[model samples]
Target: TRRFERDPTIPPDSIKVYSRTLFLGGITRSVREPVLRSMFERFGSVQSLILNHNYRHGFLKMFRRDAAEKAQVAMENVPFADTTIRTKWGVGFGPRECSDFSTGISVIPIRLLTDADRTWLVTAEYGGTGGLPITPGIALDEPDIEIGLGISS
Candidate 1:
């Protein structure tokens, strides 16, 4: 899942992004700082944000590495804030350099949708505060089968 053509110094398939800060790509110009803060706060307290309408791309620093990691996990392959925003571990405080998403050593944020992830979505929809589970052929006389659970893979 990695490449070695970008840098001969890097071991084969061993390039990595390890910063606690993140570089945000393709952000909406109209998005508010608080709106971004609200979304990322679920992962952890936001240390700082360097967003501006002048520049569509921005930088965000998380207090902890684990928080940044989890934020990346959720952001991968999902449409954020009615627009598409891409995340990557910040290599520097400035904007990321240009590259095709398909190029060497770049991380395209497409995620692997596993059975465990699907099960998690379904369980969240039916269990806990969502609602009680219905028994097979016992409850739900007129269940809404047409409506999707709205969980995106």
Candidate 2:
């Protein structure tokens, strides 16, 4: 198996579970598995690329820890088809404390969530306090699978 060379500069974390999966955001339906494989494979071989077609996000799991850890930096704020992207840890996403878009994040622009933004978020309740009217959630396109209801088999 062709595995990615571990980044010499930023090695895998001591507790490496979080370093094996990456959380993605701000993607459109047009984004596909091929794009993700090529884009993410820059650092390592992907074990899985699970996409939430309903939401504008995905999770990329890599075979080696360092690749995922490296992707957090290399892929952050990168763009594809229709939107910019945000990258982070799936470990952080499991709890509503981090990636729950409904709380206040779904309103913010799909631009990269910066460290300062995370700091501010953690420091306060942060429920749409910016005076500006928050937009409706990520506004992703729901799946357009239309089924014919008249088929009586």
Candidate 3:
């Protein structure tokens, strides 16, 4: 029995768990596995490619960690179809066993707060007091009242 050996040119420590996986964001549904495989094959051998249509993202597994790294470096922020694709080392996708349209939207705390709350809370800490009058807790539930013309004077 013989096991495949890693390429000597690539540093052994460089290829870890993250190196085996490549995450691609902003992938359109029209893009298929074959196209991704072809594009990544130039770098090295691709073991598996999983595209999540619900999230418009894809994950690729390469036989060699160096190949995955190379693909990520060469393809990061590259334009695919009408959207720009972004790449990272680790698997950025959420669990697929959940609902169909699982885009993982609950973790973002800003969504829980209202616009005024976010503006006041965030702006008070930062130095962007020029635009949008910071009215702390002004009509948290009311949507009808357009406070302070909703703009900075």
Candidate 4:
């Protein structure tokens, strides 16, 4: 299921979301910092972030959870080089899982971006405490159905 950061002030149905990186694949030691730095440029202003070497996943913290939702809307399903795009939404952030999502695709952000060629990523963390899991569901609910959580949680 697609999850987004929720802000109480904003209407529950608003399309607004936060900014984040669209994962292309697992980050190697060589590309970690450079890629993260490259991805950070798309955000308004990141407050915190961390890369996990063991899991090969990364998490970037934004002061306002809305940034993640903004990022999601900006870059969800995008394409590149004749291939359709499918972004594996990160739940809590860690390593980007490798799966059928490996198809040649580029995630595109909603707003104009310098790294337009790359598969874009946006934040919309829907799990954990103080996150989007609350707010009685909103625009983010569409992805949950689209993502297909099945019978499991």
Candidate 5:
């Protein structure tokens, strides 16, 4: 794959082949998959996509640069239901942090990948403050799908 703009630190090859990045609604509903499918249909395949199991934020891969660009144009700048889903075409996303103990901490917006801002999160690096243990305590109850759901990811 040709490099549109290779990140100085990350090898150009390390970047995943995704057409467009998206952040979806946190609510669990049928709309999630449909939204993804609708976007993926423009490219003709979802298997090539890289999606987060948390069901909020992720990326999708396309066959060629043109296809990626097309996908961006076709689906981006569109609304989610009545709300607008902001989409952008880029190689990589997420705030870069030096890999270290600071990464395992609780999830923050920088670490969050959601439809609000189509970003690819970068975790497990160093230089961020407020470290949370990887495994602090087993919850007696199933934590709000948001807390355990987003953070577990």
Candidate 6:
């Protein structure tokens, strides 16, 4: 599951606005600041690199938002050492916070559904709290369901 910083006020995937600071977690203990700094420095000048080596999380402050966004986009989900690094906007970096989400909607392609299946789609609950799981069970020949969870601010 792709767990991102939940900020409903910000548009999904718009990391450019929060370009100065990046919250990187799921870092392997084997990877140190010097190595991580070099990796990020390739994108742009890093103002500060804070790492909690024990907690395995760190924050990178970049001189420019463009550089931060560029680095994040290029490196997210990429393998570093033996672990895949995950990234999100630093606290108070984005426009506003709207992390509370309770509704999930699945948009399945019309072509992939049979006429009977399509009828069932309309009958599903429109919305609810603790909504659909990241992977909801919709019988597809292949797992091709695109689940979009929208939370109201």
Backbone clash tally (model 4): 25
* Model 4 per-residue lDDT tens digits across residues 65-86: 4555455455455443343332
Worst 10 residues of 1 by lDDT: 135-144
Instruction: Give lDDT tens digits, candidate 3, residues 61-95.
Output: 76655576688789878887888777765532222
lDDT of 5: 0.35
Scored by lDDT, the top model is 3
Give a tens-digit lDDT track for model 1, residues 8-102: 34333222223456777777776667888888899997777888667787777765556767887786554766678777756431113311223
| Count of steric clashes across candidates, in order | 0, 0, 0, 25, 10, 0
Pairs that clash in candidate 5: 18-60, 18-61, 19-60, 23-114, 23-115, 24-115, 98-125, 98-126, 99-125, 99-126
- Candidate 2 lDDT (Cα, 0 to 1): 0.48
- As a whole number from 0 to 100, the lDDT of residue 45 in candidate 2 is 75
Candidate 1 segments exceeding 4 Å error = 1-17, 80-82, 93-153
The residue pairs that clash in candidate 1, if any, are none
Q: Residue 77 CA error for candidate 1 (Å)?
A: 3.8
Candidate number with the higher TM-score (1 or 5): 1
Instruction: Give the TM-score (vs. native) of candidate 4.
Output: 0.33
Q: How many backbone clashes does candidate 1 have?
A: 0
> Deviation in angstroms for 70 in model 4?
3.6
- 1 or 3, greater by lDDT: 3
- Which residue runs does candidate 4 get wrong by more than 4 Å? 1-25, 73-88, 91-153
Q: What RMSD does model 1 have?
A: 18.2
When summed lDDT is taken over every stretch of 10 residues in candidate 5, the lowest stretch is 138-147
The Cα error of candidate 4 at residue 90, in Å, is: 3.8
Lowest summed lDDT window (length 10), candidate 2: 138-147
Candidate 1 lDDT score relative to the true structure: 0.47
What is residue 23's positional error in candidate 1, in angstroms?
Answer: 0.9
